[PDB]
Design a protein around this ligand. Structure first.
Ligand code: HEM
Ligand SMILES: O=C1N[C@@H](Cc2c[nH]c3ccccc23)C(=O)N2CCC[C@@H]12
Ligand SMILES: O=C1N[C@@H](Cc2c[nH]c3ccccc23)C(=O)N2CCC[C@@H]12
Ligand SMILES: [Ca+2]
Ligand code: NA
Length: 395
């Protein structure tokens, strides 16, 4: 009877996750609030590893039109496929995706990324009074990441349109179903008109590499538009949400920032602890059983969908000692912030790059603090990917 999700839109995780984790079942039944579909939910690290490393639990089947789902509307423009990353790997573009997202891309971009983080923070430090870290730091940094490494250079109006589409479509509630569907239509139509132009501009952004890649015909306009929409939904609200949330974590732990100021070699460990500690998605990764399967004794029938809450797994006390403590350099198992298994985040190298640049910018300037109490922060309610409306801050 427990409905999903748990409406924990701020950084305070729903107590339900710890309740289910401690129950006498390794997988617990829930019901989608948005569709009424029955779903399974996993909250334990050990069980999550077993699920996400078993390829008979399929991500593509759980994404497909008509699957039991946690979200109220399908995450695709009506009439399109909506399985972009599979379509691209299918067309044989794994080598291309690695070139635009892997370590070689990080080496191309890390210089200007760190310059931009410093320039943005330096500007804020020159101001008298308070400022807004979301509007004045995260938005320009995440927008530059999307323009320069993924899509090609966007105007402010185009960036605002894509941001609004992502915020409207990637929601559990707070907008009508038809508004949500039309957000995906608008984004698809944007790239039908503009993807070729964006791919043709100078630079090495991923969309250009995709459009220029030989495919055993070259990618059609619809396929390139689905690639554009993928890069927005997977890269934009995730990066902006996480950087906002990571800044809040740092601002609430001045002792840890002071340690990083004195010992910059410890920043990479802080990046990894932020990926474990800072909650991002309010939903779960999910997979469909492609046949009758068993998870730690519980029978999962073919066609049923099993969810894993990455936040729940990242706060599992059997995996991490004192899991609700922000402890850079804790020496436990690998976090689940980027997932697990074959679908591990391919953006993880660029994400780590921008997170590291942000942590270093903060650590160089101790004294940065929230200008309001954490409880006074206002949160966007119903987003898949948590984000505060503003982060008032000052030195
Ligand atoms: C440029 C930035 C990013 C890009 C281009 C990107 C891209 C992608 C793509 C294309 C996928 C789909 C993989 C698949 O289904 O096989 C994915 C998955 C994922 N991403 Fe990223 N991502 C970015 C940033 C982030 C950030 C900041 C996080 C922070 C937690 C994140 C967490 C994840 C997770 C957990 C998954 C796994 C989903 C699953 O297992 O079903 N991503 N990413
Ligand atoms: O490439 C995908 N992977 C999975 C997980 C996911 C990864 N990033 C996401 C962002 C929003 C929703 C889901 C995801 C998915 O549900 N997908 C629909 C939109 C993108 C597609
Ligand atoms: O909230 C969601 N999370 C992703 C998985 C994910 C979990 N954590 C993530 C972090 C970044 C990207 C994707 C994820 C997913 O598959 N969804 C389908 C409907 C809602 C949406
Ligand atoms: Ca169905
Ligand atoms: Na798999």
């Amino acid at each position: 009877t427990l409905t999903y999700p748990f409406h924990d839109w701020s950084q305070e995780l729903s107590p339900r996750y710890a309740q289910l984790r401690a129950s006498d079942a390794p997988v617990c039944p829930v019901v989608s609030e948005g569709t009424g579909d029955p779903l399974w939910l996993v909250t334990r690290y050990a069980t999550a590893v077993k699920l996400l490393e078993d390829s008979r639990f399929s991500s593509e089947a759980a994404q497909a039109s008509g699957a039991p789902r946690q979200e109220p509307v399908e995450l695709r423009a009506p009439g399109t496929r909506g399985d972009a990353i599979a379509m691209l790997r299918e067309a044989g573009l794994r080598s291309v995706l690695a070139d635009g997202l892997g370590p070689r891309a990080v080496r191309r971009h890390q210089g200007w990324i760190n310059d931009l983080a410093e320039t943005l923070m330096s500007e804020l430090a020159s101001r008298e009074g308070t400022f807004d870290l979301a509007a004045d730091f995260v938005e320009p940094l995440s927008s530059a990441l999307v323009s320069r490494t993924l899509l090609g250079e966007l105007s402010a109006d185009e960036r605002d349109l894509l941001a609004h589409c992502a915020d409207t479509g990637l929601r559990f509630c707070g907008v009508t179903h038809e508004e949500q569907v039309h957000a995906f239509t608008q984004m698809h139509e944007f790239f039908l008109e503009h993807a070729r132009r964006l791919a043709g501009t100078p630079g090495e952004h991923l969309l250009k590499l995709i459009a220029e890649a030989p495919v055993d015909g070259p990618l059609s306009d619809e396929a390139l538009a689905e690639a554009g929409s993928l890069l927005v939904v997977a890269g934009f609200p995730t990066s902006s949400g996480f950087l906002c949330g990571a800044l809040l974590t740092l601002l609430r732990h001045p002792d840890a920032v002071q340690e990083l100021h004195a010992h910059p070699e410890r920043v990479p460990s802080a990046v990894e602890e932020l990926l474990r500690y800072t909650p991002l998605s309010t939903g779960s990764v999910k997979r469909m059983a492609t046949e009758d399967l068993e998870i730690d004794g519980v029978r999962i029938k073919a066609g049923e969908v099993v969810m894993v809450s990455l936040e729940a797994v990242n706060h599992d006390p059997d995996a991490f000692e004192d899991p609700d403590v922000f402890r850079p350099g804790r020496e436990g198992p690998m976090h689940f912030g980027f997932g697990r298994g074959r679908h591990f985040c391919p953006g993880n190298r660029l994400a780590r790059c921008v997170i590291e640049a942000t942590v270093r910018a903060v650590a160089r300037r101790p004294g940065l603090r929230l200008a309001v109490a954490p409880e006074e922060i206002s949160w966007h309610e119903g987003l898949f990917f948590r984000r505060p409306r503003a982060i008032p801050a000052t030195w």
